[model samples]
Target chain A: RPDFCLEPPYTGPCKARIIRYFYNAKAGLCQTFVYGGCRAKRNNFKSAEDCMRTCG
Target chain B: RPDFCLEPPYTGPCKARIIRYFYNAKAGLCQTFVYGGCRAKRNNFKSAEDCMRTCG
Candidate 1:
């Protein structure tokens, strides 16, 4: 499995707020998170489905 | 100093194109990098000046 699945969601520290998804290993599901619009972690995904595909 | 200065520029893996800056510890300078608009590392900065101020 991708190591990103284990990573916690990172909102980052920028002003460019956006909605994104990440794999919640604990919950075994993809969840929404706020994205700061730069330098994303591997756990970040464009959609819930994307996160599920990679980490679910 | 912030450890992010030591991190390499992360372009990430999304479609949101944005211009961002990161500290290049090897060159002791702030450099521009494309940001993928989500889940940013601490190394990511909104501007060159921000990178310099934080990591310089």
Candidate 2:
């Protein structure tokens, strides 16, 4: 039970500005999502940079 | 730790709710995802009267 992450890891790479980040909770990796577009372009990224590279 | 900035720099005209601008760790300047087709345009923020001149 942790609070809703309302503090300053705030400057970490996980700020997730352009990406909608969520934890897999399974892989323990953070992930992002897009609403629509290329199915082949869809991804389950391993890092924030990787996801931003591909998704954007 | 800086506590993830949850307390808000709380208002500095940089709250990017629509545009995810983060201070580049190396550059010390904020950048956007425009290259990845994530350009940040005008925003109608949701937090305080500080973001917009006509805030509620």
Candidate 3:
């Protein structure tokens, strides 16, 4: 449930860890991306495994 | 070494494995992304850690 889909206020890489996951329909697996500063959607995760377990 | 900034042909995922690396200046590390189906520049990788090691 740790995700950053639509948070806000940040552009990206606030902490230096570029770890975020989103459900990619194309791959049908929880994919990774640099989270948008703070504003992200509900579809996001803290780790690849976490995202996969949640959405994949 | 493994990083994807530009490529062509593929809009996105063609295979089930969503693995590719791209250099994100902001992140200061080779980041992960869904590769362009066929033509994904020279900066790409088979694994997340692989890309990180090569570029990050």
Candidate 4:
């Protein structure tokens, strides 16, 4: 749920953008830039990984 | 979060698929498919609805 970075075709900025949204929206006490303990690094993640990595 | 469709840049399969995964993964009994139930879906749901409908 990249909510923010969910903008596929990953880029570093995409990663950073969602990270900010998550922290700002801070929706539902959800914390951290990435959830599910997945790594960022754009192409580093697969679909499921990218999904959770974003806002999970 | 699109831990199964939390954010945007959505497509048909993306939406339907996440909805399915959320139910299957059933991760922590949380569920929803649309409109962000906010804190209610905490990997948890409000009642029952099509995962893609969040009330979906």
Candidate 5:
């Protein structure tokens, strides 16, 4: 598994709110989270499919 | 001037909101902002005095 798969979702620091996804390696699943719209970390993904494709 | 002084205040991700401060180098002042609970960047500070002492 990729290192990012173990990382929790990062919503960034800005004020804008957005929905995003991340891989939960421990649970073997992709999970949803809120993104703050700027400077997102590697764990953040645009969709569950992307999360799964990368880390699932 | 410190690089972080030029950085805009980072509120971070997460749902927990708290008051924080950062130096606005352009304005040459320490300013207040809301910060999320975790993973704060270098620009984030607990108080105006701290921001000023470091970057003012």
Candidate 6:
């Protein structure tokens, strides 16, 4: 899978605002696509570091 | 990370037209969204059975 871009789609200093990242199995890396920003799944991560840590 | 649709974005009997399915971490399900009808990655699957066998 292609490594997905780690940039979140939101702007501002609100960390409380939900951000999202998912393991794009196709990309073989974490990607930022779905953002509510949410979820609780094996491939879900709160931040880029969190994502890279799991599957990077 | 929501589940992507597993439906291929094609018509007719062109099996080689490329199809795609990815594991949506948030939705906790395998979905079909990015279809080249394509990919070569861990989370990528040729069919639903293939996907479930790995990440389901």
Predicted structure with the largest TM-score when compared to the true one: 5
Error of 4 at A35 (Å): 4.8
Computed on C-alphas against the true complex, the DockQ of each candidate is 0.12, 0.03, 0.03, 0.02, 0.53, 0.03
At residue B34, candidate 6 shows an lDDT of 36
The residue pairs found clashing in candidate 5 are none
By TM-score, rank the candidates, best first. Answer: 5, 1, 3, 6, 2, 4
Candidate 4, residues B1-56: lDDT per residue as tens digits?
34543332211211122332234343433343442222222333334454435423
Better of 1 and 5 by DockQ: 5
Best by lDDT: 5
Q: Which of candidates 1 and 3 is the stronger one according to lDDT?
A: 1
Q: Which residue pairs clash within candidate 6? A: A1-A26, A1-A27, A1-A28, A2-A27, B4-B31, B4-B32, B5-B32, B6-B32, B18-B37, B19-B37
Model 2 segments beyond 4 Å from truth?
A1-23, A37-56, B1-19, B35-56
Give lDDT tens digits, candidate 1, residues A1-56: 78868987766546688999988888888889888886677888897777888886
TM-score of chain A of each: 0.89, 0.28, 0.54, 0.19, 0.86, 0.48
| Minimal lDDT window, size 10, model 2 chain A | A1-10
TM-score of each: 0.54, 0.22, 0.37, 0.18, 0.75, 0.31
Can you tell me which runs of candidate 6 are displaced by over 4 Å? A1-56, B1-17, B37-39
What's the TM for model 6?
0.31
Candidate 1 iRMSD, 1 decimal: 4.7
Per-prediction TM-score, chain B alone: 0.87, 0.25, 0.50, 0.23, 0.87, 0.52
Q: How many residue pairs clash per model? A: 3, 7, 15, 12, 0, 10
Cα deviation at A21, candidate 3, in Å, is 6.5
i-RMS, every candidate?
4.7, 7.5, 8.9, 8.8, 1.9, 15.9
**Total clashing pairs in model 1:** 3
Candidate 6, residue A31: how far the Cα is off, in Å: 28
User: Which candidate comes out best when scored by DockQ?
Assistant: 5
List candidate 4 stretches off by more than 4 Å.
Answer: A1-35, A43-56, B1-21, B25-45, B52-56
Task: State the weakest 10-residue window (summed lDDT) of model 4 chain B.
Answer: B8-17
Model 6, range B1-56, lDDT digits (tens) per residue? 21333332222211233455666666767676333222244556668877766666
lDDT of 2 by residue, B1-56 (tens): 12222121222223234433333334433344222212222321223333323211
